[PDB]
Ligand binder design. Structure first.
Ligand code: CLA
Ligand code: CLA
Ligand code: CLA
Ligand code: CLA
Ligand SMILES: CCCCCCCCCCCCCCCC(=O)OC[C@H](CO[C@@H]1O[C@H](CS(=O)(=O)O)[C@@H](O)[C@H](O)[C@H]1O)OC(=O)CCCCCCCCCCCCCCC
Ligand SMILES: CC(=O)O[C@H]1CC(C)(C)C(=C=C/C(C)=C/C=C/C(C)=C/C=C/C=C(C)/C=C/C=C(\C)C(=O)C[C@@]23O[C@]2(C)C[C@@H](O)CC3(C)C)[C@](C)(O)C1
Ligand SMILES: CC(=O)O[C@H]1CC(C)(C)C(=C=C/C(C)=C/C=C/C(C)=C/C=C/C=C(C)/C=C/C=C(\C)C(=O)C[C@@]23O[C@]2(C)C[C@@H](O)CC3(C)C)[C@](C)(O)C1
Ligand SMILES: CC(=O)O[C@H]1CC(C)(C)C(=C=C\C(C)=C/C=C/C(C)=C/C=C/C=C(C)/C=C/C=C(/C)C(=O)C[C@@]23O[C@]2(C)C[C@@H](O)CC3(C)C)[C@](C)(O)C1
Ligand code: KC1
Ligand code: KC1
Ligand code: KC1
Ligand SMILES: CC1=C(C#C/C(C)=C/C=C/C(C)=C/C=C/C=C(C)/C=C/C=C(C)/C=C/[C@@]23O[C@]2(C)C[C@@H](O)CC3(C)C)C(C)(C)C[C@H](O)C1
Lengths: 179, 52, 227, 176, 155
């Protein structure tokens, strides 16, 4: 919300530098998207932290196709390694949350998820502002991290485990790009 | 050696020195009239009659 | 209703650096070196001195003294790091003991010369860079709101350190401020290219320019065999 | 307030140099230095237990240098055995934490996060945990200094010394 | 104004009172015109799709360099999109997803995204009766392509 100053944190303040908020109704649409994109991209960043660390389940993801958990790539192509009969299950459960349980039509972003004494907002309202800003700020940093993780695999061809094993962290002197 | 591909015929660095010193000498005289001349003074003719 | 920066793009004066792009209203003209260059609108969202604590984290409206503070010593460091990227390759290097190891100070690639010199060399450089930043913070704790950006109390005016006299006239002093700022912005671009070429070539810049400003060994004329 | 915390039961307000009555203007920075030196030493003491218990991560901290995490010594020489480009990455991030995230020019030490996130509602339950941070912080200052001089005097790290049973300083070969 | 009831020359049967029974959002006429126009526009670029693939305009080059799949390898029948890698088909309907929400948002039931008719980069604005006339031709050729696909995909 604008009046509490939820997204405006202390390094930059009200960081709308290109002038996109020209009234109050288009802020609530944009914050509903920013908070939703931040919640998706945070679980996307914890995915790449877990996948590129090699932490896999034991057994077969698809035993009728013989596809182990170990032979899914930890990079940007690992989701499509998965058989489409299997990730139709992912789209159908996540689509059921998006329409019924956590309806993404709710622009407020509240879905009542309260983990009680870890947020007693009625007796410490400063913890409300701390946890509301940190949901956006960790979502904004993970939105740029997953755009980092995606394009670093595209321009190098290696995933994050492979380009860190090679020490390939500089776009200069390598055989890739015109630099 | 005359058929060799030298820049301005400079095969010894004596010749490079007198090219610089000759060109900088008339430059230094020319800067006595056109040094200390303002860069932002423009005109809207085909020809300028600024100063001496 | 509207953003505080959407109203700075509503006034949106004519620019000079980007004369097709209509610089925002927060570049008032009253700052040194403002040429109307803010296409991303950072001056519309001004920063405060966050390092002084939480009460200094907010930035006051229309005050770019901390953006200019970060601009000035990004450029002051960058200026002295052009020479640091160049002068070991030009004026030779320093010798080493058996303690530091011989050829420790001799790596003409400037980036792996960081990883070749001893750690006590870097630690004492970092602590000297630390000491003048302690001197900076102590100036910004005294001056506060009357703190001029880039002031380490070195030079001409009030009770500053002036071992050279340096007693400029009061508007040849603002030309020196503009000469400093234009060299700050230029050497920031220059030290980026030095850092990027040292990675891309693997050698120093005198060692890449000097190899390109020389004729190749297969192209070199045998030369001057006429008696 | 802050001038009565740090003063617990067995000593009261303990200032043998008398700088509370002499220089009260310098106290709240000197409290901030005491709290920061405490919090640094508490992570430093806990670190020496974890290092000397041979809890290492895996692999190489610097594969160019061919230097594993277990190749780091567990004593004084451990943070200086880390390569110069690696040590510069720690200090650059710790300067980002100590100037931007937890700015140490803020002298009340209060950075938005509470005690496990919560603000201590009760004002003397707050003062009890404010004293427990200071007292554990003051005890860890002597703990990390007592671990640093006792390594460089006995010549062995804390695992080395404890392996050897070099606990009694009166029947070994030392001074006195 | 492309949402009028006067384009497609009239008329057909049901008017579908089952639509307003318990799913009353789908009973709106403006969406059914927006669906018929959108099903028409997709169908029209699908017949040219089965004209270009079936004439073996295969492509110059590889489709996937690391799977080793050239463009001549994918079939020409209706199993074309289900024979490319799913890492590639994901990029296709990701880009349609930016089209479906950001660029040409399908919540805009008018279908007019400010493009004109025949001219890219600058819209050819049609003005009068010919504007009126080209709208029903879009629907009428959209309808012939909708029935042409189910005649070209059963056999
Ligand atoms: C999901 C995307 C998204 C959306 C809808 C928003 C929306 C908002 N942000 Mg947030 N933000 C985001 C991601 C997003 N943000 C990310 C990833 C960061 C980290 C860089 C931030 C950092 C940030 C800060 C620090 C602040 C905001 C604030 C705001 C609010 C102010 C209006 C504004 O600037 O809109 C943005 C304009 C648009 C979304 C429309 C333009 C769309 C562009 C053209 C798409 C092109 C993007 C390009 C492909 C990739 C960009 C990354 C690239 C530079 C590498 C608004 C609610 C302010 C606030 O909340 O104040 C109360 C505020 O202080 N944002
Ligand atoms: C360097 C960290 C540090 C700092 C800045 C302080 C500062 C303070 N202490 Mg604390 N304290 C510390 C560590 C520190 N202490 C340690 C390590 C212990 C023992 C574990 C204590 C035990 C203690 C008690 C019981 C009390 C205080 C109190 C105070 C306050 C008294 C006001 C004053 O001016 O005292 C005098 C000035 C100082 C203490 C600053 C130190 C300056 C000298 C030069 C340091 C020299 C020490 C010496 C070199 C150490 C050699 C041994 C070492 C190498 C192992 C002041 C805020 C009182 C308080 O909390 O007030 C309500 C109080 O009751 N201190
Ligand atoms: C933070 C708390 C702390 C704790 C729990 C310890 C614990 C220890 N220290 Mg450490 N140490 C500390 C802080 C601490 N130290 C500090 C702040 C310093 C100075 C910076 C030191 C400097 C130090 C040295 C140089 C040595 C130790 C040693 C030890 C071990 C003690 C063995 C012993 O017999 O001590 C002896 C008991 C005392 C020192 C306390 C009595 C104090 C009186 C004044 C001594 C009087 C002796 C005298 C001859 C009279 C004896 C009479 C008696 C026989 C009846 C023990 C593990 C020894 C070791 O090798 O293990 C690592 C050792 O050589 N410590
Ligand atoms: C390749 C890029 C391109 C360019 C520059 C144009 C440009 C034009 N087309 Mg378009 N057109 C294109 C692709 C393009 N088209 C494609 C891919 C199709 C589908 C096959 C069409 C189908 C089309 C039709 C049916 C008509 C135009 C018409 C026009 C003209 C619009 C202005 C006018 O009426 O005179 C303009 C010259 C109009 C025209 O040419 O009328 C004289 C017109 O009636 N175009
Ligand atoms: C309302 C409903 C909402 C539903 C939302 C559901 C969304 C589901 C999540 C979608 C996540 C996003 C997927 C992105 C696609 C991707 O990952 O590619 C997967 C492949 C992986 O390849 C890989 O490459 C690897 C090669 S190597 O091993 O690394 O060498 C290899 O290992 C691997 O097998 C191979 O697969 O990556 C690439 O091909 C790089 C693609 C580059 C970017 C594509 C751009 C997409 C087009 C949009 C452009 C803008 C459009 C606007 C203009 C019209
Ligand atoms: C955002 C942020 O930053 O944090 C957030 C999140 C978080 C972390 C959840 C929160 C919390 C709670 C925290 C941090 C709790 C941690 C407290 C801590 C770390 C307390 C150490 C005490 C050590 C002592 C007393 C040493 C004694 C002295 C000893 C043990 C010695 O004698 C050393 C020794 O070598 C010798 C000298 C002699 C030997 O005989 C013994 C040995 C060998 C051992 C916060 C802080 O609320 C806010
Ligand atoms: C060199 C190398 O390799 O390393 C070596 C080094 C070294 C040092 C040699 C090693 C060792 C041996 C060590 C250190 C052994 C230490 C063992 C240890 C620490 C043993 C604690 C006992 C406490 C008890 C039983 C408490 C009873 C408590 C009771 C009955 C109570 O009621 C307590 C109470 O609080 C309550 C619960 C209830 C209250 O109402 C009442 C009170 C307050 C009274 C190792 C392992 O060999 C490794
Ligand atoms: C069952 C199975 O096998 O599944 C397989 C196969 C399959 C189906 C192929 C796969 C897929 C892909 C799927 C399912 C979904 C992707 C979905 C989607 C929807 C992707 C777009 C998001 C919109 C973006 C990025 C940009 C907006 C960007 C902008 C700039 C704007 O909005 C512009 C705007 O705001 C301003 C700036 C200004 C104003 O004038 C207003 C507007 C609004 C115009 C899977 C799931 O991977 C695997
Ligand atoms: C921003 C992302 C990022 C990248 C991409 C990255 C990469 C590398 N890190 Mg770094 N790093 C951080 C961030 C990043 N690091 C952070 C947040 C911290 C906590 C403060 C941190 C700590 C250390 C320490 C102690 C060392 C270290 C190293 C390397 C080196 C390993 C390859 C090699 O050395 O062969 C590669 C290039 C070692 C080193 O520099 O050795 C000379 C080393 O000792 N890192
Ligand atoms: C933003 C720039 C961009 C890059 C840099 C890029 C890169 C790659 N594309 Mg992608 N792509 C688009 C954008 C980009 N792609 C767009 C706008 C579309 C139209 C919607 C699109 C469509 C497809 C299809 C159908 C396929 C495809 C592929 C690859 C793959 C080569 C794999 C290889 O080298 O073996 C590399 C990484 C193939 C594939 O992913 O196979 C596993 C594949 O079948 N692309
Ligand atoms: C309600 C109980 C339930 C049953 C009884 C069941 C059964 C199977 N699932 Mg499972 N599933 C969920 C629930 C159930 N699934 C849920 C809540 C999710 C998260 C949304 C989920 C996700 C995936 C993914 C990613 C894959 C997957 C698969 C299979 C397949 C294994 C044998 C096979 O290989 O056919 C058998 C039929 C794999 C697959 O379909 O491979 C073609 C595959 O990759 N599933
Ligand atoms: C009016 C009413 C009637 C009605 C009706 C009628 C006709 C309704 C209309 C139905 C209409 C809606 C039917 C169009 C489908 C076409 C859509 C766009 C999908 C195309 C599918 C495209 C994506 C095709 C793609 C491919 O081909 C391509 C490009 C390449 C190949 O490698 C593979 C694939 C498959 C990817 C009643 C009810 C019957 C009774 C009474 O008479 C009155």
């Amino acid at each position: 919300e604008l009046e509490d100053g939820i997204g405006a944190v202390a390094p930059l303040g009200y960081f709308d530098p290109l002038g996109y908020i020209k009234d109050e109704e288009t802020f609530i649409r944009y914050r509903a998207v920013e908070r939703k994109h931040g919640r998706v991209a945070m679980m996307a960043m914890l995915g790449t932290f877990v996948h590129n660390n090699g932490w896999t389940f034991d057994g077969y993801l698809s035993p009728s196709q013989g596809l182990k958990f170990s032979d899914i790539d930890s990079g940007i192509g690992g989701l499509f390694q998965v058989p489409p009969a299997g990730l139709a299950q992912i789209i159908l459960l996540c689509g059921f949350v998006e329409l019924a349980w956590w309806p993404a039509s709710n622009l407020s972003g509240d879905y009542g998820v309260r983990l009680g004494t870890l947020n007693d907002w009625e007796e410490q309202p400063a913890k409300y502002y701390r946890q509301k800003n940190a949901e956006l700020n960790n979502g904004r940093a993970a939105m740029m991290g997953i755009l980092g993780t995606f394009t670093h695999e595209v321009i190098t061809g290696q995933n994050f485990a492979e380009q860190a094993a090679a020490g390939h962290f500089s776009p200069f002197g390598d055989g890739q790009g015109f630099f | 050696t005359e058929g060799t591909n030298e820049w301005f015929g400079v095969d010894d660095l004596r010749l490079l020195a007198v090219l610089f010193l000759g060109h900088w000498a008339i430059l230094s005289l020319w800067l006595g009239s056109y040094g200390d001349s303002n860069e932002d003074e423009d005109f809207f003719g085909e020809i300028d009659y600024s100063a001496r | 209703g509207a953003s505080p920066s959407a109203d700075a793009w509503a006034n949106s004066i004519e620019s000079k650096a980007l004369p097709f792009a209509r610089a925002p209203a927060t570049l008032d003209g009253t700052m040194l070196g403002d040429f109307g260059f803010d296409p991303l609108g950072f001056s519309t969202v001004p920063v405060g001195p966050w390092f002084t604590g939480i009460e200094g984290r907010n930035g006051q409206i229309g005050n770019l003294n901390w953006y200019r503070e970060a601009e000035l010593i990004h450029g002051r460091i960058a200026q002295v790091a052009v020479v640091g990227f160049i002068a070991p390759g030009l004026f030779g290097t320093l010798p080493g003991n058996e303690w530091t190891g011989v050829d420790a100070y001799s790596n003409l690639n400037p980036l792996e010369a960081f990883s070749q010199v001893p750690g006590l060399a870097i630690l004492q450089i970092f602590l000297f860079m630390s000491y003048l930043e302690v001197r900076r913070i102590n100036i910004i704790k005294e001056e506060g709101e009357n703190y001029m950006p880039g002031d380490l109390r070195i030079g001409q005016g009030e009770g500053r350190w002036n071992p050279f006299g340096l007693d400029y006239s009061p508007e040849a002093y603002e030309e020196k401020r503009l000469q400093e700022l234009k060299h700050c912005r230029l050497a920031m671009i220059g030290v980026f290219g030095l850092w990027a070429q040292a990675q891309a070539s693997g050698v120093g810049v005198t060692e890449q320019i000097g190899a390109a400003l020389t004729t190749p060994d297969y192209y070199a004329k045998a030369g001057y065999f006429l008696p | 307030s802050e001038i009565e915390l740090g003063a617990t039961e067995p000593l009261g307000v303990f200032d043998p140099l008398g700088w509370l009555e002499t220089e009260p203007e310098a106290f709240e920075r000197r409290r901030a230095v005491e709290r920061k030196h405490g919090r640094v030493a508490m992570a430093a003491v806990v670190g020496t237990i974890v290092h000397n218990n041979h809890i290492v991560f895996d692999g190489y901290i610097s594969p160019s240098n061919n230097l594993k995490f277990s190749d780091i010594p567990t004593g004084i020489d451990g943070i200086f055995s880390v390569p110069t480009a690696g040590l510069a990455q720690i200090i650059a991030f710790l300067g980002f934490v100590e100037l931007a995230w937890l700015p140490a020019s803020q002298y009340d030490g209060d950075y938005g996060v509470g005690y496990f996130g919560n603000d201590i509602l009760d004002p003397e339950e707050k003062a009890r945990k404010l004293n427990a941070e200071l007292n554990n912080g003051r005890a860890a200052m002597m703990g990390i200094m007592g671990n640093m001089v006792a390594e460089k005097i006995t010549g062995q790290t804390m695992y080395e010394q404890y392996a050897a049973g070099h606990f009694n300083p009166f029947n070994d070969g030392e001074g006195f | 104004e492309p949402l009028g009831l006067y384009d497609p020359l009239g008329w057909l049967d049901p008017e579908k009172d089952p639509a307003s029974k318990f799913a009353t959002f789908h009973a709106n006429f403006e969406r059914r015109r927006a669906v018929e126009r959108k099903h028409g526009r997709i169908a029209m670029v699908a017949v040219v799709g089965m004209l270009f693939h079936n004439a073996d305009i295969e492509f110059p080059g590889y489709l996937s360099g690391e799977l080793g799949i050239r463009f001549s390898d994918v079939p020409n029948g209706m199993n074309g999109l289900f024979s490319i890698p799913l890492a590639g088909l994901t990029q296709i309907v990701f880009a349609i997803g930016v089209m479906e929400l950001a660029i040409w948002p399908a919540s805009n039931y008018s279908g007019d995204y400010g493009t004109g008719y025949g001219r890219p980069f600058v819209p050819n604005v049609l003005e009068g009766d010919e504007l009126k006339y080209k709208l029903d031709m879009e629907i009428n050729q959209g309808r012939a392509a909708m029935m042409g696909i189910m005649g070209a995909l059963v056999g």
